[PDB]
Design a protein around this ligand. Structure first.
Ligand SMILES: *[C@@H]1O[C@H](CO)[C@@H](O)[C@H](O)[C@H]1NC(C)=O
Length: 168
RNA sequence: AAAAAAAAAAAAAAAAAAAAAAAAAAAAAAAAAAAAAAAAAUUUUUUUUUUUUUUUUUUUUUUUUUUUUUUUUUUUUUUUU
């Protein structure tokens, strides 16, 4: 099974077909990286309500439900790089107000519409790379009050314009 | 038909860090060798220059004995010119 070992559920290569929910729910760090994930269930995380951060990376997730942002209000790091994530919207980030770290290294998110990060105020680092972005625009209004580094690499942006960089 | 995430096999090529070895070369340290050389301590050869002892040849010198001649100073005696 997983490692636990004082609140670091580092679940290595273990042929875990489904997301487990074991007795040691009193942990803060959980790692779903390198685990067979069909999708993140909006209700299977009720047992683990103390997860400060979750390392659910490189998995196979079609889309993210908004409920995941309210089942774990105390969420800091959301490392979900190398997933399918064909399309995403702001609705799934409504309740993620405490989010501080985002990692999306391969998701093929070609088009981004509206303001997906209208509720993210403590989000520091943005990792949106190799997702085939054609433009650097992320919205029309002013958001991202407190962020430090913006990662937009390996995408297909053709030019930078004043109208698409005025959202900050 | 095509593109991608987790899970599993992998064959090839380019690189590397190690272990077990093996020839080759080069460094030394010990056992020998063949010699062209070097002394030293025991035998002795040839040759040159010189010392001592002993046996003898030639020449010279001294003394003694014997003997032949040139000179002799004496003549005891003998017949005399
Ligand atoms: C969520 O939990 C249920 C009950 O254990 C399980 O059948 C299901 O597979 C879980 N979800 C995923 C995506 O595995």
């Amino acid at each position: 099974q997983c490692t636990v070992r004082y609140n670091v559920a580092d679940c290595s290569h273990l042929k875990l077909t489904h997301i487990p929910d074991d007795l040691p729910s009193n942990i803060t760090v959980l790692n779903l990286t390198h685990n067979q994930l069909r999708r993140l269930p909006p209700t299977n995380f009720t047992r683990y309500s103390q997860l400060a951060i979750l390392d659910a990376g490189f998995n196979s997730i079609s889309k993210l439900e908004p409920e995941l942002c309210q089942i774990l209000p105390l969420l800091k790091v959301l490392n979900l790089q190398h997933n399918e994530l064909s399309q995403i919207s702001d609705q799934t980030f409504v309740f993620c107000t405490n989010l501080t770290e985002l990692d999306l290294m391969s998701n093929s998110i070609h088009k981004i519409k509206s303001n997906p990060f209208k509720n993210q105020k403590n989000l520091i680092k943005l990792d949106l790379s190799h997702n085939g972005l054609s433009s650097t625009k992320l919205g029309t209004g002013v958001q991202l009050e407190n962020l430090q580094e913006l990662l937009l690499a390996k995408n297909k942006i053709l030019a930078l314009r004043s109208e698409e960089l005025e959202f900050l």
